[PDB]
Amino acid sequence: HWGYGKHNGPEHWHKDFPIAKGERQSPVDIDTHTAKYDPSLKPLSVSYDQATSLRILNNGHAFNVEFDDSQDKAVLKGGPLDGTYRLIQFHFHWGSLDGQGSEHTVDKKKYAAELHLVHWNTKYGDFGKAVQQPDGLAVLGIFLKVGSAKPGLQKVVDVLDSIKTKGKSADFTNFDPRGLLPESLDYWTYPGSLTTPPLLECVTWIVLKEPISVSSEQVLKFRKLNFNGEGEPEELMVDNWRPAQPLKNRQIKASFK
Numbered sequence: 001h002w003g004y005g006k007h008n009g010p011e012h013w014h015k016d017f018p019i020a021k022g023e024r025q026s027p028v029d030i031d032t033h034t035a036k037y038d039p040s041l042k043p044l045s046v047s048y049d050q051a052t053s054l055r056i057l058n059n060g061h062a063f064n065v066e067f068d069d070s071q072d073k074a075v076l077k078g079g080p081l082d083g084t085y086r087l088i089q090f091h092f093h094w095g096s097l098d099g100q101g102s103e104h105t106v107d108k109k110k111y112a113a114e115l116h117l118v119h120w121n122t123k124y125g126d127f128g129k130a131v132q133q134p135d136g137l138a139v140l141g142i143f144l145k146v147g148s149a150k151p152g153l154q155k156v157v158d159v160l161d162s163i164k165t166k167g168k169s170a171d172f173t174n175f176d177p178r179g180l181l182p183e184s185l186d187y188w189t190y191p192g193s194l195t196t197p198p199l200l201e202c203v204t205w206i207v208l209k210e211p212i213s214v215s216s217e218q219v220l221k222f223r224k225l226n227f228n229g230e231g232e233p234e235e236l237m238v239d240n241w242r243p244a245q246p247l248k249n250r251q252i253k254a255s256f257k
């Protein structure tokens, strides 16, 4: 039922999901001047060398690239995190035009899109148990701006024609997510939530400061996907982002001086 349209979008979600008005909702605006360096943060470790991708799915809201999370392979450690978090999937949020699409904003500036690499805390055994815990998930967020092409994104772009409509999937083995990172791992971090229903308040957000550049042609292909299923009237999959939510009783910490 929930979506991004006028009649089922972010301003309606609270009726079924009252936590939408909660105390640690995401995304937020990142005020870079108020964000403070945190010396208690440990070095961040993104260890994706043995990642095993499996499948790509159009779920009617975005597309997910899914990974084998039955054992410790691609993991995120360090930074603000206690213990080991396993990669389960990544997806994007994007706009109808280059001037909007990100969920987090930086001094109110909206990027063209935002990549979310989703990980769960292995001390809870499964993703479903992890989303019953305050520290169950860690999402690594990466901004996309439009400029030069990102070579490591092209394999994703070129499979999208095969998953145009809701419910379609395709094999997506042997994809290396290391090709989606920027050079620097400088980041901001804060406690938040899932940005889509069920909006659960389980996430440690780690948002990289350096955006990746993708080409106009790459993001234009994201915008050819459909929210609807096969045979149904075409609704382009665009503007699948939630706007910034109140910061409330939180502080954003920076990894860099």
Ligand SMILES: NS(=O)(=O)c1cc(F)cc(F)c1
Binding pocket: 116, 118, 139, 193, 194, 195, 196, 197, 198, 199
């Ligand atoms: N968009 S998000 O990364 O917060 C996200 C991740 C997830 F695993 C499930 C969700 F419902 C939402």
Ligand SMILES: OC[C@H]1O[C@@H](O)[C@H](O)[C@@H](O)[C@@H]1O
Binding pocket: 049, 050, 051, 052, 173, 174, 175, 176
């Ligand atoms: O195929 C994508 C990636 O898969 C990983 O499991 C391999 O260890 C990497 O060498 C490879 O780049």
Ligand SMILES: OC[C@H]1O[C@@H](O)[C@H](O)[C@@H](O)[C@@H]1O
Binding pocket: 036, 251
């Ligand atoms: O009481 C002082 C403390 O206030 C907190 O809000 C800040 O996060 C700390 O960095 C600071 O040392």
Ligand SMILES: OC[C@H]1O[C@H](O)[C@H](O)[C@@H](O)[C@@H]1O
Binding pocket: 155, 159, 171, 172, 173, 174, 175, 176
């Ligand atoms: O790596 C992701 C995918 O990239 C390309 O589409 C390859 O043709 C395919 O075999 C692979 O699964």
Ligand SMILES: [Zn+2]
Binding pocket: 091, 092, 093, 116, 195
């Ligand atoms: Zn997301």
